[PDB]
């Protein structure tokens, strides 16, 4: 039949999962975001539309830092992307309490990651409408 | 409820003309054995504060990662952190203390005596203190521990009331530290030879000396000195 695509968690008779993939529809009308590794870091930049000459300029952020040394910059619904930046904020918190040496980017991807992959568990959560880079330098 | 197991001494400062300084030996004493001799408990955030703390070093490196978080914490979506919204002492302060009087609200106690000591933005001097029970105060100079006792007592002569802060100079100040740090050297059979001290000054920022030496001590009189009361050789 038909309506595979009204709840999160459901798998369409071919697998996929249409409320993530209708997620991902708010995120390509989003502003572009890029992000470059170079040969000793890594550099974010992203497109901040001017709606009008009312947006004070260099004001409305977007570059979001996690620790002190992570970056992370998304395009889509900017407050998911900033609920997705609180979450990795505690995730880095946590593991540097623990281990003391701030978490490795590696690591702090699979925390947003798998963070993500469980709003896309349950119906009673809505997928996150926002595809994220991130990066930073770490031990290696 | 708890006890301190590892301890750090007095913490002795003073305010002056342009800034703060503040001092503290390199010990951790674990009762009477003067267990480690590297530690420094001068806690710096950022360059307008220096956080001196004594008391049970174990909560001492607790306080230290929580003074490191609130400075990672302030930077998140802070544009202005390293300028107009950048950590103030009096903010760091007021964190302490808050934490300060909620653990000993709960009955267990960081068992601490700290002083904050710094310049705000204004340029405004900046010294207060808050123990393990919570209490606060500041004054023109401030000690804890055996500092209280006898640093407070020959620093108060160069800094009686709040008058005599812009009479005194950066070299008047640190040579009075300099010479608590003796005394107590020579009577606080919990403390070492060795201390780091720090200045903030709201022109020449934060300066922060270590591993100091008390010197110029006075021990030769003790060659005259022979017995307890009758005995003459």
């Not at chain 1, 209708?22 to 502003?31: D, L, M």
């Not at chain 2, 409820?1 to 003309?17: A, F, L, R």
């Not at chain 2, 006898?150 to 620093?155: D, G, V």
């Amino acid at each position: 039949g038909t309506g595979y695509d009204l709840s999160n968690s459901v798998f369409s008779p071919d697998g996929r999962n249409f409320q993530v993939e209708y997620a991902v529809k708010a995120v390509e009308n989003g502003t572009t975001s890029i992000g470059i590794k170079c040969n000793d870091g890594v550099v974010f930049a992203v497109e901040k539309l001017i709606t009008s000459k009312l947006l004070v300029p260099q004001k409305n952020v977007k570059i979001q830092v996690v620790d002190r040394h992570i970056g992370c910059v998304y395009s889509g619904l900017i407050p998911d992307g900033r609920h997705l930046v609180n979450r990795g904020r505690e995730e880095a918190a946590s593991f540097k309490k623990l281990y003391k040496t701030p978490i490795p980017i590696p690591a702090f991807a699979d925390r947003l990651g798998q963070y993500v992959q469980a709003h896309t568990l349950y119906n009673s959560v809505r997928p996150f409408g926002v595809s994220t880079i991130f990066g930073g330098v770490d031990k290696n | 409820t708890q006890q301190p197991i590892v301890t750090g001494t007095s913490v002795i400062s003073m305010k002056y003309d342009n800034g703060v300084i503040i001092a503290a030996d390199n010990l951790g004493s674990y009762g009477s054995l003067l267990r480690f001799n590297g530690v420094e408990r001068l806690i710096p955030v950022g360059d307008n504060t220096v956080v001196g703390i004594s008391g049970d070093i174990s909560d001492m490196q607790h306080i230290e990662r929580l003074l490191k978080d609130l400075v990672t914490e302030n930077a998140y979506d802070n544009p202005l952190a390293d300028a107009e919204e950048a950590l103030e002492p009096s903010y760091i302060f007021e964190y302490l203390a808050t934490v300060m009087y909620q653990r000993r609200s709960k009955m267990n106690p960081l068992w601490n005596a700290i002083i904050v000591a710094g310049v705000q933005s204004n340029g405004d001097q900046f010294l207060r203190y808050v123990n393990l029970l919570g209490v606060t105060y500041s004054s023109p100079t401030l000690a804890t521990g055996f500092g209280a006792h006898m640093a407070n007592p020959l620093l108060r002569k160069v800094v009686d009331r709040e008058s005599d802060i812009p009479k005194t100079t950066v070299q008047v100040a640190e040579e009075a530290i300099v010479n608590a740090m003796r005394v107590l050297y020579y009577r606080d059979a919990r403390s070492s030879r060795n201390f780091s001290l720090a200045i903030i000054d709201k022109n020449t920022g934060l300066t922060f000396k270590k591993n100091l030496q008390v010197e110029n001590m006075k021990w030769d009189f003790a060659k005259d000195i022979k017995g307890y009361g009758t005995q003459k050789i």
